[PDB]
Structure formats: structure tokens, C-alpha cells
Amino acid sequence: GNPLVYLDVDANGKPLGRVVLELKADVVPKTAENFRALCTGEKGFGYKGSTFHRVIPSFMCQAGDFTNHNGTGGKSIYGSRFPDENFTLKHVGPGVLSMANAGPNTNGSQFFICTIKTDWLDGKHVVFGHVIEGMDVVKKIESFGSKSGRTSKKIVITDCGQLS
Numbered sequence: 637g638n639p640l641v642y643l644d645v646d647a648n649g650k651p652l653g654r655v656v657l658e659l660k661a662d663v664v665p666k667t668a669e670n671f672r673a674l675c676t677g678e679k680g681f682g683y684k685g686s687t688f689h690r691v692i693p694s695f696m697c698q699a700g701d702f703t704n705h706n707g708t709g710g711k712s713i714y715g716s717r718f719p720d721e722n723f724t725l726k727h728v729g730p731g732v733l734s735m736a737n738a739g740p741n742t743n744g745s746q747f748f749i750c751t752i753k754t755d756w757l758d759g760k761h762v763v764f765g766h767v768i769e770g771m772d773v774v775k776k777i778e779s780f781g782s783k784s785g786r787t788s789k790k791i792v793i794t795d796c797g798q799l800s
């Protein structure tokens with residue numbers, strides 16, 4: 637089956653809770669596998685100890701720049717970047733998990749969780765999963781963002797991994 641993975645998140649060292657994600661390996665295997673492995677840390681690098689660096693209320697929460705911590709960086713388990721796999725899944729509502737990019741075929745490690753329907757991203761960002769549990773936790777992260785994207789507390793993925 638599809639992987640089920642988790643992110644345990646804190647704000648200034650205080651736990652907010654767990655976000656559980658399904659990864660749609662049946663539709664985007666290569667994209668789902670990248671994320672899965674960055675959660676477990678099995679390649680020697682990954683999301684543990686990195687931040688949500690760009691959080692815009694009524695839009696999305698963005699994370700995954702584990703090299704530069706600011707939106708410039710990240711890397712995939714394949715190499716620095718990898719192709720757009722396909723655009724079959726759409727940005728249908730809150731809870732969609734999608735790849736951030738710098739244009740076509742520039743996927744690395746950065747990702748976002750939507751807090752609204754972001755359909756203007758369809759055909760431009762590769763959707764690869766969704767939130768199974770913990771949308772309340774995502775709304776807590778969202779509360780610490782601002783319209784500029786800058787966060788008011790440091791929001792850290794303190795642990796992550798695979799449940800099944």
C-alpha cells in the first residue's frame with residue numbers, strides 16, 4: 637500500500653502535535669519515494685531538525701529546505717533536482733501535499749501543505765499526497781505565519797518517519 641508518514645512539529649521548542657500524511661505512490665511513485673525517504677532519514681539526510689520557513693495564512697505552509705533553511709535550498713534523494721513526474725492529482729482543497737519548485741523540472745525536497753484550495757497551481761506543482769490526521773496541527777502552524785511568509789516563532793520538524 638501507499639506509505640503513511642509523520643511529522644512531529646514544535647514552535648520555539650514547544651510541541652504542537654503530529655501531522656500524518658498519505659503518499660500517493662500508486663500515482664507518483666518517484667515523488668512519493670523521495671518524500672518517504674527524507675522522512676525516515678535512511679539516505680543520511682532529511683527533514684528531521686529542519687523548519688517551516690514560509691507560512692502564509694489562508695494559503696499554505698512550506699517546508700523542506702534542510703540545507704539553507706530559507707527557501708533557496710534542499711535536495712532530493714536522486715540528486716539536486718528531479719523531473720515533474722506527472723500532474724494527474726490536483727490541488728482540490730485544504731490538506732493537499734504538493735512539491736514546491738523554481739519552475740519546470742526543479743523538484744528537490746521543499747514541499748507545502750495547503751490550507752485552502754490552490755487550483756491555480758494545477759499543472760505547475762506536482763501533488764503527491766494529503767493529510768490523514770492533524771489538520772488541527774497544520775492550522776496551528778498556519779497561525780504563526782504572516783502575509784509576508786515570515787513566521788513569528790521558529791517552527792521545527794522535531795521528528796519524522798514512516799508508520800506503514
Ligand SMILES: CCOC(=O)CNC(=O)NCc1ccccc1
Pocket residue numbers: 696707708709710735736737738742743744746748
Ligand atoms: C506554494 C508553492 O510555492 C513555491 O513553490 C514558490 N517557490 C518557492 O518557494 N521555491 C523555492 C524553491 C523550491 C525548490 C527548489 C528551489 C527553490
Ligand SMILES: [K+]
Pocket residue numbers: none
Ligand atoms: K495572495
Ligand SMILES: [K+]
Pocket residue numbers: 795796797
Ligand atoms: K524517527
